[PDB]
Amino acid sequence: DTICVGYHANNSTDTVDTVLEKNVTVTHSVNLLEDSHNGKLCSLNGIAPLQLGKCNVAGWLLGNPECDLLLTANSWSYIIETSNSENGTCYPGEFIDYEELREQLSSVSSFEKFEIFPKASSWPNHETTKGVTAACSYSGASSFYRNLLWITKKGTSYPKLSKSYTNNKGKEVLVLWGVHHPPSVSEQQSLYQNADAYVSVGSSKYNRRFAPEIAARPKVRGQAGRMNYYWTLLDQGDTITFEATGNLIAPWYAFALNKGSDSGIITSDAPVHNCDTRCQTPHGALNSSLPFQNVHPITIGECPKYVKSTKLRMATGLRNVPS
Amino acid sequence: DTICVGYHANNSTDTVDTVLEKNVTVTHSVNLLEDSHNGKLCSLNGIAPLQLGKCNVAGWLLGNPECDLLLTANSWSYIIETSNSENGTCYPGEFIDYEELREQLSSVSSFEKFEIFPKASSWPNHETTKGVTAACSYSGASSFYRNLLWITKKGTSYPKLSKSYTNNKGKEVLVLWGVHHPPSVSEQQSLYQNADAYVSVGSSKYNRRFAPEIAARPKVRGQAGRMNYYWTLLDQGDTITFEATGNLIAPWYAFALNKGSDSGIITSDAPVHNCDTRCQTPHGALNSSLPFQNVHPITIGECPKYVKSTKLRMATGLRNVPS
Amino acid sequence: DTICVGYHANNSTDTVDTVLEKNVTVTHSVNLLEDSHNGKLCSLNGIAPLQLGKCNVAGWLLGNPECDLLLTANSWSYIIETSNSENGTCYPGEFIDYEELREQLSSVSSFEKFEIFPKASSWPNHETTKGVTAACSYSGASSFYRNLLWITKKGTSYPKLSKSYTNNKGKEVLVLWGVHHPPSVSEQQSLYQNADAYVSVGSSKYNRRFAPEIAARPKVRGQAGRMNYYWTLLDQGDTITFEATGNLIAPWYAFALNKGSDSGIITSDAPVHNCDTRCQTPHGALNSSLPFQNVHPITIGECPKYVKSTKLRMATGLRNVPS
Amino acid sequence: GLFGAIAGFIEGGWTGMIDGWYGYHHQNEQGSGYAADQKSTQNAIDGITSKVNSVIEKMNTQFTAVGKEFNNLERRIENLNKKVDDGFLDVWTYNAELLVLLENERTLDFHDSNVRNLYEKVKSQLRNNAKEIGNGCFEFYHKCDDECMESVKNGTYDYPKYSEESKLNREEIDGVKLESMGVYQILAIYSTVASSLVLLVSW
Amino acid sequence: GLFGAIAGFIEGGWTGMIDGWYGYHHQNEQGSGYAADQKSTQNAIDGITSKVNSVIEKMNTQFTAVGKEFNNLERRIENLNKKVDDGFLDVWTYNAELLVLLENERTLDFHDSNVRNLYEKVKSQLRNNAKEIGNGCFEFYHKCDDECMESVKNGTYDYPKYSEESKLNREEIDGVKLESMGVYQILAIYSTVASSLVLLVSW
Amino acid sequence: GLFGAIAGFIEGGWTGMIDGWYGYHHQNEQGSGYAADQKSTQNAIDGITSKVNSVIEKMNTQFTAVGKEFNNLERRIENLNKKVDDGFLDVWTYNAELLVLLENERTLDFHDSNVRNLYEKVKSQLRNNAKEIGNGCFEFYHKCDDECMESVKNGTYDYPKYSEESKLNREEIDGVKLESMGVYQILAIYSTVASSLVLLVSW
Numbered sequence A, B, C: 001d002t003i004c005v006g007y008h009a010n011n012s013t014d015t016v017d018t019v020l021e022k023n024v025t026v027t028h029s030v031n032l033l034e035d036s037h038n039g040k041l042c043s044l045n046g047i048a049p050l051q052l053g054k055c056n057v058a059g060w061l062l063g064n065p066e067c068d069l070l071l072t073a074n075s076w077s078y079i080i081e082t083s084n085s086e087n088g089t090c091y092p093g094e095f096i097d098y099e100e101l102r103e104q105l106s107s108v109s110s111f112e113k114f115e116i117f118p119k120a121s122s123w124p125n126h127e128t129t130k131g132v133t134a135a136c137s138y139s140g141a142s143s144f145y146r147n148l149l150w151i152t153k154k155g156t157s158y159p160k161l162s163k164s165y166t167n168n169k170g171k172e173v174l175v176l177w178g179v180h181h182p183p184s185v186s187e188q189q190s191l192y193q194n195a196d197a198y199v200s201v202g203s204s205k206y207n208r209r210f211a212p213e214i215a216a217r218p219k220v221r222g223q224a225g226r227m228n229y230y231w232t233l234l235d236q237g238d239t240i241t242f243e244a245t246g247n248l249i250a251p252w253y254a255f256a257l258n259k260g261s262d263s264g265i266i267t268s269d270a271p272v273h274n275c276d277t278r279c280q281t282p283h284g285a286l287n288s289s290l291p292f293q294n295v296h297p298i299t300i301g302e303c304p305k306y307v308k309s310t311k312l313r314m315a316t317g318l319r320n321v322p323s
Numbered sequence D, E, F: 001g002l003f004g005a006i007a008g009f010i011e012g013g014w015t016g017m018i019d020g021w022y023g024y025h026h027q028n029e030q031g032s033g034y035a036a037d038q039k040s041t042q043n044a045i046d047g048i049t050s051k052v053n054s055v056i057e058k059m060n061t062q063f064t065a066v067g068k069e070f071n072n073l074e075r076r077i078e079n080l081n082k083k084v085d086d087g088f089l090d091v092w093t094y095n096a097e098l099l100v101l102l103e104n105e106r107t108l109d110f111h112d113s114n115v116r117n118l119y120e121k122v123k124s125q126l127r128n129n130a131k132e133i134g135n136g137c138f139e140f141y142h143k144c145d146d147e148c149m150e151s152v153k154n155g156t157y158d159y160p161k162y163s164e165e166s167k168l169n170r171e172e173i174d175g176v177k178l179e180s181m182g183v184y185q186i187l188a189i190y191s192t193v194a195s196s197l198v199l200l201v202s203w
């Protein structure tokens, strides 16, 4: 009789690497790495996301009328651009500080869109209906943006324009506007009847005098002129004044904004579904508790951390050695 | 007769956490982390740090007469703001490149203030003392900055101005000036009587033409006019030429600068005492040689390193196991 | 008999430090850290680098004829500056966005310099040769950049200028030009005989209206006027038009560009030879496979990794303890 | 610090053991062993569980990080951002793999030390009995039932209760032919030789 | 790597010991022990001192990090600044905590190793005397005063000085004395004649 | 984690040994020892080689890093650039030196444990023979050649072949020297005289 002493053994074959040795077959282990994900993009914390489709963000906020379907959108979890998202600006030009605008979008949650200057009332001086381009056409019909307003003269006449606007909505208000210029002096007089012209934008902290330019250039989309774009955050209290002579693209819609951080500009093309998670990638959604994520670095939510490895098995057990 | 072999034990109580077990009672240990600070802000190496009190940096440098007390300061350990420092620019406008000017101040230790152009001598054509407003008022009087000079016409008669200065002080000299523009054209002619005007500044590396603008805007502090601010470093050798017609806030003092690094713009509110340490926080001074620090990340001086935990006791000894 | 058991021993002397002890002599060790290098600047994988000599990058791309020597240079591995490289702009002004232009050259490998506008063809309206300063002199003779062109009047008459150019070369095209302005209205008319002036450049994504300025300023190199410089990348396809009145420095050459990244602006003065390595520092080239490097951080190509230590010997063996 | 017990002087494992990680195999009068030791293995389970929970605790959870945007003039800032990202990525993958490797070394040696400590504890409470052989196996000079087995597994043995029979039993095991010759030396064989001398002397 | 000494077979600490960390408790005829070993505790003190000072040495002192400022158009840059600072703070706090934990494991096992090495060195020079019992205690078959105890503490023993009597003690503790009892085995009476035969053959 | 072998109970090194790291020294009837064990040293070779190779594999090879430039209005961005560089430099030099120190500790302890386990295996296969003395030195009660040496060095001993005569030798060790001829009750030379009687009878 004897009391021979020994340890447990298994039939398992998961291997853990150590420093002194590779591929050690251990009894029991525990994973620490993730790779599983659906190919779906679910809502975050119950709140639906937003998809633009074939729409750049700038084309959406200006209301490029190919982006007409998502007109009544007001609340999102995170904005999804697509690979096919290309309807930016219809009229050729330049949207100044587009990047800074996109990061100020990254901490807004919802909207209150409203008429700034009511088109039937605010303009008792000028023809506000004979201005459109065929380059920004829509189903054949010559069309225009949905938040702006082209302004024309009224029968070889121009009263000098001035207009204020006040904030009394508590939250901050974002206001856009634009400046047109043609490439020829003849067209410049043909629309505006002024040798020189100027606008001025002033609130308290933004202030600039704008003046057009007239210069020939190769046309794009059948248009040789250009149009620049500008935008400013307002505050409660402080007011804004526009004062125009020749080249005004009048604001016609504003936005009241809402806080609540962590918004994203994830670009993917996986479809949208209607479950709920706490983590979201371009390649899918996650559901885990291991502290290391391997799928993709760009995350939204409370996600575990991105690494660049393959196998991170941690051994909790013995050297499984048969006899 | 026995020779039993044993080990030291204690009534020690302090616990250290190891990996395999929490709260293990050790005979001897040593802390590695700091918590203690005074509520006091002492001299760094004997030099008293400059406090601004209720004064913004630019309001000090242009010399708001609100900030009259700390006028003849010329050296510091570092620079202290409080949360009530609001007397910056009394007259509304824009101080361009304020942050870069703050950063250049972060490596300068001491000043020499001096007249560039004497108020009584250098200006034999223009009224020098009849332009000052009530928006920058001071104790009933209508006042103005202490380092600049408003310029007006001299009785419906106004020569074109041009004036130079050469640097001959070896150290780098800082120059500030400003451009007023009124909001209305009749006021522009009322003060200057030039339909157009311009100023220009050239050194060797700086060259800028300024034109004013005139436009209406909702008033601030009883003023709808505006006034911008511009600044330029110089070197030993290179000169500066002003060529000004109509809108010039003339410089009236300069600053011979110095080296002497490691200057900060700590904003706090704990008062000033007179010890001397080698570390400085917005919450107090520090005095130890433990390498880890827990109070506050923003430091000035040779300071131990900021982490984000609470307990880092290190065990030096045995498990206190009585019997 | 006995079967006494002993370990190996040696006469080796080198020491590895452990945590518990300094200077422990180990029988066998291995170093991990590099110190030694030739003082040579060899070729990366066949292709030699380009030395500038007394040549600034800006002076080269403008073709300052001090740096006439490297006229035919069109392919390199990387770019070498020296401490004596000082010939940039011979005419005083400001090469705008010099850093950004340096960064875009940090991934370009080779060119194809060619005439944009031939000297005696594209300009049958102006005098093409009689304006050249002596400030950019060569052997005393009033000389000028070899890549641009000064433009004068033509006998008290001066046509409005417009000129187009297209790209049909399948790569990106790099284009330079400049704007002169003199200090006096006298020199303005005497050069150009137009009180107003402007130029205008536009392709599809660049669009700017330049206007001169006229102001007095202290002269540099005997010139009280200045010249601003500008540059633009083109695309395959998209074309460029210039429309100028009276202040033009027209181009005379372009650059067809080639990819191939990993090239920089390493400055040193250690000499050039023609070996082949796969790592290059300002003090010389490296040759090992150890994972740690000590000589200099600024490295070109695959290099062992830079640290700030002096001794990283790793013990592989026993404590060399004799009797 | 491989202590040389597992795959050492003890070669293999036990498949027939089920319950814990550390156990015995008695081979007494009736029945056989493979009975676990739930006492010591509980400490192992608690320590490893604390270890794993601590490692999961020391890593944080990052929050929403989105790629940013630039135009064609901000290239310095763009490479700056890219450099920051690849730097932090390399640092965290370095930390992760290095940490898991060193933990795996130390946990295998923790199991080895537990095995060896149990073997030490067993042999310590058996003073001069059972004449151990090989891979930790014994003999038990005195014969005893399940009860002494269970006692020793509970760390109780009462050595003087068995010492005298085991001492005699060891000594008769220590007797090889010394049960047959007992003249305090090679004397029993030796006595016969002198007789021959006396018989030849008086012959 | 718990070697099994601290709270292992040796159960408790000693409140009575004052000077060092590792001691002796001699129990001869006059007085009791509680005397330190200043030799081997000195090495451990020096090593732990070296360890602490090295850990102090490898950290550095951060210099004057000042908050920066930005206007409302440099939001990208300011977010980049925040991401940089948060990442580096996380890196350093992780390295600090992990360093402290692994050091604590290793230093407790260092003390364990010192205890075990001392006990083995004691058992080494006392080969077969003193019949070690329980939690590290010894017996001394032969009797000896403070001088032998001091020599033991100096690691000197001159063991063939004390062998035979202690051997005799281990003989007289463990002698089958019924087999001798003065005279048995008829060997004494019988062998005497042989010597008489030898004295006859010699003469 | 000093287990006590090297510079412990085993004092010095062997300059005379060449081939492996861990060897023996026989002192049998002809010649002296100094032969390696190529077996167990090969495992240490493989482990240390894997150790160094894995450490090399973890560290990575950086690509082209060129310094950048800024004008006089970009002091903030330049200082940000500098802070990023200094941070990553300090983090990597910290990780490198700390990694090297911990691996140095572990490799010295690895050699220590291998030496001790070698000693344990040798003592394991020799149960009641050779009466181990000094710095791990042995005696062999029975006398044998180089073949039993080679047997032991192949982990074989065939102990029942050599048990009996070495055992009989082990019993007769003691009394030949405590009287300079031995201590015995009344038959020490007496029996010797009976032998002499056997000689004088068998001339």
Ligand SMILES: *[C@@H]1O[C@H](CO)[C@@H](O[C@@H]2O[C@H](CO)[C@@H](O[C@@H]3O[C@H](CO)[C@@H](O)[C@H](O)[C@@H]3O)[C@H](O)[C@H]2NC(C)=O)[C@H](O)[C@H]1NC(C)=O
Residues within 6 Å of the ligand: A054, A066, A086, A087, A089, A090, A135, A136, A137, A221
């Ligand atoms: C909204 O986005 C869509 C797709 O992103 C735009 O459709 C594309 O518009 C371009 C610009 O005109 C078209 O290129 C030109 O098309 C004409 C006729 O096909 C051709 O003569 C030209 O040589 C050039 O190819 C492109 O064809 C068209 N895409 C498709 C599939 O037809 C659309 O223009 C955007 N909306 C607005 C208002 O710009």
Ligand SMILES: *[C@@H]1O[C@H](CO)[C@@H](O[C@@H]2O[C@H](CO)[C@@H](O[C@@H]3O[C@H](CO)[C@@H](O)[C@H](O)[C@@H]3O)[C@H](O)[C@H]2NC(C)=O)[C@H](O)[C@H]1NC(C)=O
Residues within 6 Å of the ligand: B066, B086, B087, B089, B090, B135, B136, B137
């Ligand atoms: C220096 O800083 C102080 C602190 O802000 C300034 O005092 C503040 O000045 C403003 C401007 O008048 C005051 O706000 C207005 O006050 C009037 C009358 O009190 C009221 O009718 C307005 O509706 C508005 O509230 C503010 O009360 C006043 N606060 C204090 C504590 O004095 C001061 O003006 C600054 N100096 C200069 C030269 O700007």
Ligand SMILES: *[C@@H]1O[C@H](CO)[C@@H](O[C@@H]2O[C@H](CO)[C@@H](O[C@@H]3O[C@H](CO)[C@@H](O)[C@H](O)[C@@H]3O)[C@H](O)[C@H]2NC(C)=O)[C@H](O)[C@H]1NC(C)=O
Residues within 6 Å of the ligand: C064, C066, C086, C087, C089, C090, C135, C136, C137, C221
């Ligand atoms: C190419 O670079 C070289 C050196 O970097 C330039 O040579 C230096 O040019 C400056 C002005 O062009 C000279 O400074 C002036 O020299 C005169 C006469 O000595 C003196 O009276 C002035 O006070 C001032 O010092 C300088 O002497 C000269 N140095 C050398 C070593 O030649 C050269 O001008 C550059 N090429 C071009 C086209 O700009």
Ligand SMILES: *[C@@H]1O[C@H](CO[C@@H]2O[C@@H](C)[C@@H](O)[C@@H](O)[C@@H]2O)[C@@H](O[C@@H]2O[C@H](CO)[C@@H](O)[C@H](O)[C@H]2NC(C)=O)[C@H](O)[C@H]1NC(C)=O
Residues within 6 Å of the ligand: A022, A023
């Ligand atoms: C460690 O194991 C991995 C996995 O391979 C499996 O395990 C081995 C023990 C053996 O049974 C293999 O047949 C199994 O497939 C090995 O990694 C692969 O090895 C093969 C052969 O060298 C190679 O073709 C694959 O590309 C490897 N793939 C990966 C992802 O590792 C590995 O070689 C083993 N050894 C070491 C030192 O890691």
Ligand SMILES: *[C@@H]1O[C@H](CO[C@@H]2O[C@@H](C)[C@@H](O)[C@@H](O)[C@@H]2O)[C@@H](O[C@@H]2O[C@H](CO)[C@@H](O)[C@H](O)[C@H]2NC(C)=O)[C@H](O)[C@H]1NC(C)=O
Residues within 6 Å of the ligand: B015, B022, B023
């Ligand atoms: C680990 O210890 C901390 C500190 O508590 C001390 O240590 C314990 C072992 C025990 O001796 C306590 O009396 C000591 O004060 C424990 O954290 C505290 O726990 C108490 C409840 O007992 C709670 O009221 C406090 O808020 C806790 N303090 C902090 C800073 O968390 C902790 O619970 C112990 N954990 C384990 C597993 O032992």
Ligand SMILES: *[C@@H]1O[C@H](CO[C@@H]2O[C@@H](C)[C@@H](O)[C@@H](O)[C@@H]2O)[C@@H](O[C@@H]2O[C@H](CO)[C@@H](O)[C@H](O)[C@H]2NC(C)=O)[C@H](O)[C@H]1NC(C)=O
Residues within 6 Å of the ligand: C015, C022, C023
């Ligand atoms: C560790 O040793 C080095 C070099 O000394 C050699 O190694 C010793 C172990 C011993 O064998 C000496 O005889 C050898 O010469 C020391 O390095 C230098 O030490 C002196 C002071 O002793 C100092 O003035 C030098 O600056 C040191 N230089 C460098 C490059 O280190 C080292 O100091 C020794 N360790 C300690 C803890 O001081």
Ligand SMILES: *[C@@H]1O[C@H](CO)[C@@H](O[C@@H]2O[C@H](CO)[C@@H](O)[C@H](O)[C@H]2NC(C)=O)[C@H](O)[C@H]1NC(C)=O
Residues within 6 Å of the ligand: A275, A276, A277, A287, A288
């Ligand atoms: C995400 O994972 C969790 C846990 O892995 C899932 O929750 C489990 O759901 C099943 C089905 O009802 C239950 O049987 C389990 O008990 C749940 N586990 C826990 C821990 O709650 C969850 O279903 C997964 N999916 C989503 C969308 O949350």
Ligand SMILES: *[C@@H]1O[C@H](CO)[C@@H](O[C@@H]2O[C@H](CO)[C@@H](O)[C@H](O)[C@H]2NC(C)=O)[C@H](O)[C@H]1NC(C)=O
Residues within 6 Å of the ligand: D146, D147, D148, D149, D150, D151, D152, D153, D154, D155, D156
């Ligand atoms: C460990 O085992 C021993 C014996 O193997 C136990 O001691 C006896 O156990 C039996 C049955 O459990 C009781 O009837 C006796 O009263 C026990 N005591 C004696 C004989 O003195 C012991 O209880 C077990 N447990 C522990 C914790 O020691």
Ligand SMILES: *[C@@H]1O[C@H](CO)[C@@H](O[C@@H]2O[C@H](CO)[C@@H](O)[C@H](O)[C@H]2NC(C)=O)[C@H](O)[C@H]1NC(C)=O
Residues within 6 Å of the ligand: E146, E147, E148, E150, E151, E152, E153, E154, E156
């Ligand atoms: C270690 O202890 C022994 C035992 O006391 C010391 O040996 C004696 O030292 C005393 C000192 O007063 C002398 O008088 C004796 O002659 C010594 N020898 C004996 C008793 O045999 C010894 O000196 C101590 N030190 C060392 C290094 O061995």
Ligand SMILES: *[C@@H]1O[C@H](CO)[C@@H](O[C@@H]2O[C@H](CO)[C@@H](O)[C@H](O)[C@H]2NC(C)=O)[C@H](O)[C@H]1NC(C)=O
Residues within 6 Å of the ligand: F147, F148, F149, F150, F151, F152, F153, F154, F156
């Ligand atoms: C290990 O050593 C043993 C004994 O030293 C070897 O056994 C001997 O092998 C030789 C080879 O020719 C035979 O002649 C002997 O008869 C063997 N037996 C003895 C000496 O008792 C053994 O071969 C060695 N090698 C291995 C792999 O075990």
Ligand SMILES: *[C@@H]1O[C@H](CO)[C@@H](O)[C@H](O)[C@H]1NC(C)=O
Residues within 6 Å of the ligand: A011, A012
């Ligand atoms: C190993 O044996 C267990 C018995 O507990 C069994 O459940 C398991 O299926 C076996 N392994 C495999 C891979 O089948």
Ligand SMILES: *[C@@H]1O[C@H](CO)[C@@H](O)[C@H](O)[C@H]1NC(C)=O
Residues within 6 Å of the ligand: B011, B012
């Ligand atoms: C523990 O006892 C010692 C006895 O000398 C005493 O000095 C010490 O103060 C005691 N500990 C505490 C916490 O009081």
Ligand SMILES: *[C@@H]1O[C@H](CO)[C@@H](O)[C@H](O)[C@H]1NC(C)=O
Residues within 6 Å of the ligand: B275, B276, B287, B288
């Ligand atoms: C700072 O600490 C040192 C030592 O810790 C001490 O001597 C000194 O009094 C403390 N205070 C000051 C103001 O230096």
Ligand SMILES: *[C@@H]1O[C@H](CO)[C@@H](O)[C@H](O)[C@H]1NC(C)=O
Residues within 6 Å of the ligand: C011, C012
């Ligand atoms: C150590 O001995 C070897 C013997 O081969 C010899 O080659 C070597 O030079 C010696 N080292 C020194 C420092 O003399």
Ligand SMILES: *[C@@H]1O[C@H](CO)[C@@H](O)[C@H](O)[C@H]1NC(C)=O
Residues within 6 Å of the ligand: C275, C276, C277, C287, C288
């Ligand atoms: C670099 O070093 C290797 C090994 O030392 C050597 O073979 C080679 O010739 C060296 N030079 C080059 C250019 O690779």
